Every structure is written in C-alpha cells, then in structure tokens.
Design a protein around this nucleic acid. Structure first.
Ligand SMILES: [Mg+2]
Ligand SMILES: [Mg+2]
Ligand SMILES: [Mg+2]
Ligand SMILES: [Mg+2]
Ligand SMILES: [Mg+2]
Ligand SMILES: [Mg+2]
Ligand SMILES: [Mg+2]
Ligand SMILES: [Mg+2]
Ligand SMILES: [Mg+2]
Ligand SMILES: [Mg+2]
Ligand SMILES: [Mg+2]
Ligand SMILES: [Mg+2]
Ligand SMILES: [Mg+2]
Ligand SMILES: [Mg+2]
Ligand SMILES: [Mg+2]
Ligand SMILES: [Mg+2]
Ligand SMILES: [Mg+2]
Ligand SMILES: [Mg+2]
Ligand SMILES: [Mg+2]
Ligand SMILES: [Mg+2]
Ligand SMILES: [Mg+2]
Ligand SMILES: [Mg+2]
Ligand SMILES: [Mg+2]
Ligand SMILES: [Mg+2]
Ligand SMILES: [Mg+2]
Ligand SMILES: [Mg+2]
Ligand SMILES: [Mg+2]
Ligand SMILES: [Mg+2]
Ligand SMILES: [Mg+2]
Ligand SMILES: [Mg+2]
Ligand SMILES: [Mg+2]
Ligand SMILES: [Mg+2]
Ligand SMILES: [Mg+2]
Ligand SMILES: [Mg+2]
Ligand SMILES: [Mg+2]
Ligand SMILES: [Mg+2]
Ligand SMILES: [Mg+2]
Ligand SMILES: [Mg+2]
Ligand SMILES: [Mg+2]
Ligand SMILES: [Mg+2]
Ligand SMILES: [Mg+2]
Ligand SMILES: [Mg+2]
Ligand SMILES: [Mg+2]
Ligand SMILES: [Mg+2]
Ligand SMILES: [Mg+2]
Ligand SMILES: [Mg+2]
Ligand SMILES: [Mg+2]
Ligand SMILES: [Mg+2]
Ligand SMILES: [Mg+2]
Ligand SMILES: [Mg+2]
Ligand SMILES: [Mg+2]
Ligand SMILES: [Mg+2]
Ligand SMILES: [Mg+2]
Ligand SMILES: [Mg+2]
Ligand SMILES: [Mg+2]
Ligand SMILES: [Mg+2]
Ligand SMILES: [Mg+2]
Ligand SMILES: [Mg+2]
Ligand SMILES: [Mg+2]
Ligand SMILES: [Mg+2]
Ligand SMILES: [Mg+2]
Ligand SMILES: [Mg+2]
Ligand SMILES: [Mg+2]
Ligand SMILES: [Mg+2]
Ligand SMILES: [Mg+2]
Ligand SMILES: [Mg+2]
Ligand SMILES: [Mg+2]
Ligand SMILES: [Mg+2]
Ligand SMILES: [Mg+2]
Ligand SMILES: [Mg+2]
Ligand SMILES: [Mg+2]
Ligand SMILES: [Mg+2]
Ligand SMILES: [Mg+2]
Ligand SMILES: [Mg+2]
Ligand SMILES: [Mg+2]
Ligand SMILES: [Mg+2]
Ligand SMILES: [Mg+2]
Ligand SMILES: [Mg+2]
Ligand SMILES: [Mg+2]
Ligand SMILES: [Mg+2]
Ligand SMILES: [Mg+2]
Length: 90
RNA sequence: GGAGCUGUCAACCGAGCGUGGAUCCGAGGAUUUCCGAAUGGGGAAACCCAGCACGAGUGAUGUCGUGCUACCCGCAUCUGAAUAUAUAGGGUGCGGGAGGGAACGCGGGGAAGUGAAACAUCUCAGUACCCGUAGGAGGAGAAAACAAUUGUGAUUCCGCA
RNA sequence: AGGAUAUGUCUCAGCGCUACCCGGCUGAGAGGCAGUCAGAAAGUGUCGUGGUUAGCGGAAGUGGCCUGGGAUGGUCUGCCGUAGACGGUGAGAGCCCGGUACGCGAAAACCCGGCACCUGCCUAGUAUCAAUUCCCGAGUAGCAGCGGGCCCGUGGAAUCCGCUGUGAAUCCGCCGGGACCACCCGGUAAGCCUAAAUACUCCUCGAUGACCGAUAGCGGAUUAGUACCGUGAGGGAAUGGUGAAAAGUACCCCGGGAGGGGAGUGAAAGAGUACCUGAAACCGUGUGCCUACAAUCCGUCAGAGCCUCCUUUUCCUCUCCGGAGGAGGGUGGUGAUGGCGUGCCUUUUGAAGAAUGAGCCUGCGAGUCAGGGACAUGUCGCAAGGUUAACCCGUGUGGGGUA
RNA sequence: GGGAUGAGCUGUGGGUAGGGGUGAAAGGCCAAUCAAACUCCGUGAUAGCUGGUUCUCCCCGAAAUGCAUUUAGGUGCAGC
RNA sequence: CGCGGCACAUCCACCUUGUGGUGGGUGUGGGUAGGGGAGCGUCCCUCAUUCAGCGAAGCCACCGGGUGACCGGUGGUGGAGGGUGGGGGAGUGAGAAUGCAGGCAUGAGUAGCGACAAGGCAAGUGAGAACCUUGCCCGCCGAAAGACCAAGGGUUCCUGGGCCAGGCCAGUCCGCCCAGGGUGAGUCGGGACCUAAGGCGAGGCCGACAGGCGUAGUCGAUGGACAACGGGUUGAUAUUC
RNA sequence: GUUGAGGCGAAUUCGGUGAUCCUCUGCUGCCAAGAAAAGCCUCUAGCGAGCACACACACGGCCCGUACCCCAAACCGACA
C-alpha cells in the first residue's frame, strides 16, 4: 500500500474523523492499518485499538495538510521514490 | 517489485529473517524416492531378488553409491547349421516403436428397441457400439469431368435448385 | 522417343585410339535463379517501431449543514474528465482505495520476420520438315457370376466399389455422354504430392448475459467423484450467511457440569459461535366464554345468556375530573337452544359411499422450443408487384447483396 | 429324526460365464433376484392402457347415434 | 308478482350518430365435455416518473374496499430495495400423480429392552452406584463358556486422563473419546531353495482386425528340503530380550 | 512385607495303570494300484598347482511378520 508503518496519517472517515496518529502495523493483504488512539475498543481481561481500513486515512505529508500520494521519476538513484501531490516533495 | 515476511483449513504459540532488498511475480537451469507403456528378472501396482563395470568400506565375507542389462522393427557389419552353393539362425553397433489425451477426421465391422396401429421387404440407420489410424486439422484435389449444338474448366465449404 | 534442315549462360583442366571438323562427358572456376516451400534438405550468425511470458505511471473535495454507530444519503457548494467500466471502503463514491482512459516497459527464453553465411538448380537447344518405327502406368481394363452403394428395393439399370473366373490393346488405343447400335462431342484410368476457404475445445487469456442464486445452478459454493453402498464393473449423497469491527460476554451468583441470572460490549444480544430475516405444520403456559341426560360430514340460518371495549341518556356532580354505577346503542369473543345439512378428487349410467387416491405443513413438480415448415385468422409496410438466402462492410440492433 | 470307512465330510489353491456354464435332472444353482445373471450404454425404449395437468369472471353449450374398420373400451367420415 | 343492484343481446333517439360512449324499452342470464370474450396476481428488461437507514423487501396483526381472481390504509417486526404508468419477455399460479425432498404428528409414554447360569452382603470411590473397585459367600461352564493358532480385522493392546455422543436402563466403567507408549529372531511362519493343479508366455502356429492356443521358460503351497531347548524378566514383546 | 518387590528354602523312592503319541516311510492283508522337482549320494565330461584335514582365536549371518481379538462384543451376518 501507499501507507507505511512509520507514516503519520489523518482519519477521513469513521467515528474518529479528524484525529491524527502514526501507523503501528500495516496489513497489506487485508488493506488495514493500526493507528494509535483510533477506534480504541474495550476488550475483556483475564483497552487497545483495532485496525481500520486503509481507505479511511490520508498520509500527512509531514508538512501540515493531508495529501494523496504520487511518485516522481527518480533512478537516477537507484529506484523509485514516494512523494506527495498538492505541492509534493518527499 | 519495494516493506514487511515465515501458504491454507486455522488458530495458538515457539523461533527467526528483511532496504547489504526478504516474502512475492516471470523466465531459464539443478535436484527429482518408488509405481506406472514400465522395459534386468519376478510380482498381490507402488514390493521382492539380481548380473556386469567402476568406485567406497571391512582384518575378510557381508554392505553401500553410480551407470548399463526387456521385446520387436529397420539399417550396417561378422558367421553360413542339417549341407555343398547357400539360406534359416546367431553375434556386434547404430536408430525407431510401445502408452496417454475432451472433442473434431479418415478407413473397416455393425445392432435392437422404435415406425410401419400386427409383421419378414423396408425403417430405425450406416445410428449406438466396436476395431485400425491420424493431424492441427483431416479427407478431397488438377478431368479417362460436366454440358449439349453454345459453353464451363482441380478440390472443398455455405445458400438455392 | 527416334530421323533430316536447324546452334551453343561464360571460360578453363582432363578424357573420349591417333593428325583434323563437329562434338559430347567429367571436374573446377565465372554469372543468374530459388530456398526452409506441394514443387530439396539442414544448420549457423546478426538485426528487429515485431509479438508472448512479470509490470509501472496515470486528473479531480481532509468542503459546510442535517440524520445516523458509521455518509458513499439529503441540501448547499468546489473540481476532473482521452478517465461517469467494475469492485471495495462502517448505507447509492468520477474526485477515499485497487483501479479505468491513455501511455511507458523485457536479462533471458520462445514465436515471427529481415539480412548474410549456407544449400541447390540452371552450363543451348530453338524452330522447320519427315510420317517409317517405338512409348504413353496389367493379371489392369473389358466380359460373366455373386454382392455392396448410388433418387434408383434387380429392374430395360448406365456410372462407382469388393470377391471368383476369363482376360485385352498403346492413339487407326481406350474410356464417358443412364440398356444397346451408328454418328458426334468430351477426356486421356490402372503412379505420387499439394496451401486457403470447413469441423472441434481437455486447455490459456479477455469479455458478456431481459441465465441460476444453496430442494436452484455442474453430481460437486461445504472433506466431492468424497462419505457411503456393491465381490466387481459400477452407483453415489447431505451440509453456505453473527457482527461494521470479536469488540465472542471481564467479574459476581445458582449449579458436578450443561445451562442460566446480574453486570459488560455492541446502533442492535428483538445479532451470544445452538448466531441475518425467522412463515406453517407441531408442542406448551396464562386467560374470556362454553361443555359431565346426550347420538354432532362438525358447518350454516335463527338465537338467549355471559365477557370485553367504545358511545347516547340520568346519576355519583366529587365534573378540569373521571366515569364507578343505571339504561340505551354499537364493536369483538363465546354459543345454551331451534331448523337445514350424505367430505374432497378421480372414474363412472350412477359414489356420502363399504370403488380409487390422500397422516400434516413448507418447498419443488406437466401443451414448451426449433423451422423464410403447413392451414386459418388479427395487425402493419409496400403494391402488379412483394421479398431477400448465403455472403460483404460496420462498436449494435445499421447499410449493401437479384441467386 | 437320517448318514456316520464312504457314491463320506472338510481346509487351502485353482478351472468352467449368460442362449453360456454346471446339473445322481428339481427348470435346480451361477453373490439374499434366474423359463436366460448383473452393470453401463441405445434411452427421455414402447404402452389403442392407468394415473396426473396449477388463477378468475362473462356468453353459448353437447354426445353416448349412422357407416367402415385385425373392429368392438381405439379410430376415420357423417350427425349433434 | 313487488322493490333495488349487475350483465349479455336487440331495438329506439343523441355524442366521432357502430372504435365506441349518453338515455330509454323489450327479451335473456342452471350447466359437464367443449368453443368464444375479457381480466387478477408473481418475476425479469426497457422508457418516464416517484419512494426509501427520518427505514425498502419479507413476515405478523388490525381496520376497510371491489362483481371474481384480489386490493388499500394503519401498526409491529425487520434492515436494503420498492411503487406507478407506456411497452417487451416468462422456469408465471398445485390439493390430489400409492408424486419428490425436508420438518413434524397419530398409534403412545404404548410394544420391546435379544436364550432358562443367579445372584447377595460389607467396605470403598464419587455430585451421582443394582451395574465401577476390593473382600467374602452362592451359582454356571469345564471335549468349553478353558488355553493356543490360521483366515479376517487393524491399534481395538499398555499407561494417564474423560464422561452431553455410543453401550437397548444408569454409569465414576468400557472394545467409546483424547494424548503418549508398546511388536527386538542365523534356528518360529514365509522370501532369498523346490515343484503340483493352474496362470503368464520369447520365438511360434492359427485367425479379416480385435484376437485364440501354445514351446522354450517363468511364476504358483494347500505339499518336498532345511539349524534350539529350559528358565527368568516388562504395564504392555518374547523359542526374538 | 508401603501386601510391589525381597531373603531362605525340605524331601524328591518304589509300584500300578496307560494312550489319539514313539519304534513304524515298519509288518500283514487288499485292489480301486496309489505327485513332481529341488536336495543328498555317486559316475565321468571337465578344471586343476596347489591342495584336503585337525586344533585354537576372531568374526559375518539379510528382507517381511511378531502388539491385541480369534465359536467372537474386535471376523462374515446393516447391530455389543
Ligand atoms: Mg521464484
Ligand atoms: Mg521391472
Ligand atoms: Mg514383468
Ligand atoms: Mg554352407
Ligand atoms: Mg497413440
Ligand atoms: Mg426391427
Ligand atoms: Mg410396429
Ligand atoms: Mg403400437
Ligand atoms: Mg501433431
Ligand atoms: Mg491432406
Ligand atoms: Mg500501480
Ligand atoms: Mg450525528
Ligand atoms: Mg457502495
Ligand atoms: Mg460504481
Ligand atoms: Mg473509505
Ligand atoms: Mg495413361
Ligand atoms: Mg463386374
Ligand atoms: Mg444394389
Ligand atoms: Mg444397378
Ligand atoms: Mg477381372
Ligand atoms: Mg445416351
Ligand atoms: Mg492425397
Ligand atoms: Mg486444407
Ligand atoms: Mg446442489
Ligand atoms: Mg434460503
Ligand atoms: Mg469396498
Ligand atoms: Mg452497550
Ligand atoms: Mg435489528
Ligand atoms: Mg438480527
Ligand atoms: Mg435454529
Ligand atoms: Mg435468527
Ligand atoms: Mg347438562
Ligand atoms: Mg335420531
Ligand atoms: Mg345447529
Ligand atoms: Mg335431517
Ligand atoms: Mg360399474
Ligand atoms: Mg372413500
Ligand atoms: Mg367410510
Ligand atoms: Mg362401490
Ligand atoms: Mg377400479
Ligand atoms: Mg377395492
Ligand atoms: Mg389409502
Ligand atoms: Mg413465442
Ligand atoms: Mg399477414
Ligand atoms: Mg444304516
Ligand atoms: Mg449310524
Ligand atoms: Mg476361483
Ligand atoms: Mg442371457
Ligand atoms: Mg416340470
Ligand atoms: Mg441366489
Ligand atoms: Mg431373452
Ligand atoms: Mg434410438
Ligand atoms: Mg344456456
Ligand atoms: Mg334462469
Ligand atoms: Mg351460464
Ligand atoms: Mg368447460
Ligand atoms: Mg439505524
Ligand atoms: Mg423481490
Ligand atoms: Mg414493513
Ligand atoms: Mg410488489
Ligand atoms: Mg415497466
Ligand atoms: Mg411451473
Ligand atoms: Mg403445497
Ligand atoms: Mg401428496
Ligand atoms: Mg394401546
Ligand atoms: Mg412389556
Ligand atoms: Mg440381554
Ligand atoms: Mg454400597
Ligand atoms: Mg483395554
Ligand atoms: Mg455418559
Ligand atoms: Mg445411557
Ligand atoms: Mg497362453
Ligand atoms: Mg508373441
Ligand atoms: Mg507351466
Ligand atoms: Mg516360487
Ligand atoms: Mg505350505
Ligand atoms: Mg500379552
Ligand atoms: Mg510377539
Ligand atoms: Mg502375542
Ligand atoms: Mg488369527
Ligand atoms: Mg459384527
């Protein structure tokens, strides 16, 4: 996916819309990501958060506003690189 | 190709790998037990027992590893039984076949039920089935042909008639 | 084929008994042609705007408000579009995601094509005349017998195929034109090869559906040719759905457990792994009415009495009440009692019948399709004309197409 | 109750296959079915016979006779 | 006959004076096989329009409606698709086929609980004991109901757990369920030795094809040949240790 | 003696009866006249310069089965 483990994201749909966090685990096969502070659930002992669908997040470009992800033609060294749209640089 | 991964039922774990590029996708190669046309011999398929050669191992028999060893046909060579010419046959070396596959092709063998308001000619039907044998298709195909007073000009397939 | 006039792709070495003309043959070199082909068979390099086998990029809303667990819904708005295909995402998404239009991409391998190497063929015969001779596919053709097959069932039965017998000729030959004969016309059997137009899909990609949606659709959405049955060849099932997310009920109580209650999660437990919705048969519990002196196809018409819920009167007038209660009127439930009344289907002259069939519920289960078929009709277009079939061209349902 | 040293009983291995086998003979037996086994295929065999054939209302409304028939419980034509 | 509603036909006049409507007379309206005419309901497609997480479908109840098939409104349940109109197409309607599949009744808490050897008490275990464990009595078999094999079966054997399925009752037990363990051969039974009946069968002979038979040979025990006895030991093997 | 394992451990003589077993693949009788091959011994063909034997020591002895039921609740009968 375009959302990686260390990325910081913003929630664009669901109960926790508008919250900010960073990914903790990516599940490319199921198209889910685990983000702290989002849909924390009260499991029974003897509270943690559950993964949300990757469609519900935007990767924050680390420059403020959320954005969609594109790629620039690198390599030139030595492979492809992930950058942003909406004034993209990465 | 680019950040996760160690397939699934099917989770639980355990232990690890990955930007020095994993997992994953494509291509080529290596490995590939035993049975099976099964083909060293045998056999109740997946088991048993060998021969030869070269290696390994043992104090030496035992034991292990790798190759080759069916039958038939064709070709090439050596030999020429009863028997003389010779042939049958035999030895050696090269090639080849065998079996499988859903349908379609070609050649050959070929029912009955049913219909005939009974039934044998007839039909069903050259169908079902069987045998042989292919190819990506096959079969046919280049006039010992049609036509009829004019002419057409190898074959195949479609529509008419 | 063989004879007489009639000549040397280009050259060279040899040879054809010797000196000569004309040669001819072999080998080599020189040129032209063809080539993976039916007409000859392989291989070797190199090059592809070539193709196949992985793939990559790819525009545009974190918009406001309302409802909601959740917006992809409604309403205001902003934008992209060579992209408004499809699918997912917590409910109907072109702008959230995979993607789509469109455009890039191949080490290597394979397929295809090109160019060379390579292979092989061509190395004088052209015409004229002669009409004397030779050749033109043999146990074949023809003929006879018995059969098969042709529209043709043996018929006057040609043409084609098989077995048996007999058995020709080489152009003045032989065969065919539906018995046969004469003439005429056509053709040249008994040797071989040959692309395309045609048939099919185990399989691999990409699409589609006025097709099915879990008793359907494949036997097979589930362990499926499995379980199971048969000695065997064979036969051959049944079983899908929590929730958006396991957040799958911590803890306490009764209980050996099973199970439950309280808490808790969840929008919902009126989703608790026996789980979406949750019908009927069938089985309970509570309750209103009726029923133990009566002979009942079980209903129907007449009909008292109870029970219940609403209203019009006169009464509690406490009345803002509300209505107890009284009467009346009407709903609905039940039905003491009176009359009438022989279940359904099929098959029959005729059945309540002691003729057939049915224990009950739910689901499934029978006049369909094809054809320029045949007859008759309704309707529509054109009209002394109407209409195309195959086929061709188009993204289609459109345009051509006169047989 | 019969035989129980015999034309005996029995174990193991083998052979005969469907118009065929085998039968001291009953049409007996051939995998609980035999006057021609079983399985798959022709095949959705055929049946003048039996059964079944699903929503509604409006108008009209029969026949069980004649002739023929390998015909009589079928069908063709007539009649209605 | 009286009064009211419906329908078909015909007649009489109007409206487009027959595509059909308006009003009024008269006749007619039982019905099997069968013929004609017109409709209801379910599903799918197309065009237009409209409703829907502020709750579609489906189901259930109530209140109403139409000449019939049937329809509408309201509420409840439920959680994603419907309504109407002009057309098009059907796997379009079941109560019967000793129909098929699933579920469930009646018989009914009924018959039966599988030999005529026979059980009892004490103690124990446990939530639970006629059936399980221990002890002691009693009874039965003893040419088997004892002890070994072969064929067949396949883990049923041992130990430790289990108790909702199974055992014709219950079960703490089990040939049931779960995990782990367990089978030791120069001499035993077989092969590596041998052959019978019979099978296959190089060449071969026969047969249109398919194939039939058969020589050399090679398989094939139920038979021939061939070397072990006694004792001990494990929870489970023993002529094997 | 945790009733598992432990430790010790006597006498063992002479008769009777008596086989479906052994001598006996023998013996007798009978007619219905009663497998094969390997194995073993022997003959030579043949091979043959090294042999055959005794003792002692040290070694090699392969593959499959082996649990359990087995007139049964474990096999064939759909069933304990
Ligand atoms: Mg790989
Ligand atoms: Mg072999
Ligand atoms: Mg063999
Ligand atoms: Mg000679
Ligand atoms: Mg083949
Ligand atoms: Mg016939
Ligand atoms: Mg007939
Ligand atoms: Mg008939
Ligand atoms: Mg081929
Ligand atoms: Mg060909
Ligand atoms: Mg991409
Ligand atoms: Mg809200
Ligand atoms: Mg959606
Ligand atoms: Mg879409
Ligand atoms: Mg989303
Ligand atoms: Mg010729
Ligand atoms: Mg002839
Ligand atoms: Mg004929
Ligand atoms: Mg003829
Ligand atoms: Mg002849
Ligand atoms: Mg003629
Ligand atoms: Mg040819
Ligand atoms: Mg062709
Ligand atoms: Mg099915
Ligand atoms: Mg369903
Ligand atoms: Mg079986
Ligand atoms: Mg809650
Ligand atoms: Mg709900
Ligand atoms: Mg629910
Ligand atoms: Mg249920
Ligand atoms: Mg439910
Ligand atoms: Mg009374
Ligand atoms: Mg009476
Ligand atoms: Mg009454
Ligand atoms: Mg009466
Ligand atoms: Mg009668
Ligand atoms: Mg009756
Ligand atoms: Mg009765
Ligand atoms: Mg009667
Ligand atoms: Mg009858
Ligand atoms: Mg009767
Ligand atoms: Mg009955
Ligand atoms: Mg039609
Ligand atoms: Mg017409
Ligand atoms: Mg006697
Ligand atoms: Mg006796
Ligand atoms: Mg046998
Ligand atoms: Mg038969
Ligand atoms: Mg008799
Ligand atoms: Mg029998
Ligand atoms: Mg017969
Ligand atoms: Mg047929
Ligand atoms: Mg009438
Ligand atoms: Mg009347
Ligand atoms: Mg009527
Ligand atoms: Mg009728
Ligand atoms: Mg809601
Ligand atoms: Mg629907
Ligand atoms: Mg509703
Ligand atoms: Mg509807
Ligand atoms: Mg419509
Ligand atoms: Mg139907
Ligand atoms: Mg029904
Ligand atoms: Mg029924
Ligand atoms: Mg009774
Ligand atoms: Mg009783
Ligand atoms: Mg008993
Ligand atoms: Mg007690
Ligand atoms: Mg046991
Ligand atoms: Mg129990
Ligand atoms: Mg019990
Ligand atoms: Mg043979
Ligand atoms: Mg042979
Ligand atoms: Mg033999
Ligand atoms: Mg043997
Ligand atoms: Mg034996
Ligand atoms: Mg034991
Ligand atoms: Mg043992
Ligand atoms: Mg044992
Ligand atoms: Mg045994
Ligand atoms: Mg049994």
């Amino acid at each position: 996916m375009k959302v990686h483990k260390g990325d910081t994201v913003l929630v664009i749909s669901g109960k926790d819309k508008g919250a900010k966090g960073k990914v903790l685990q990516a599940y490319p096969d199921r198209n889910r990501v685990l983000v702290e502070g989002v849909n924390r659930i009260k499991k029974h002992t003897a509270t943690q958060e559950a993964p949300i669908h990757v469609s519900n997040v935007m990767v924050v470009d680390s420059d403020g506003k959320p954005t969609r992800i594109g790629y620039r033609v690198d390599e030139e060294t030595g492979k492809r690189v992930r950058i942003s749209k909406r004034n993209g640089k990465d």
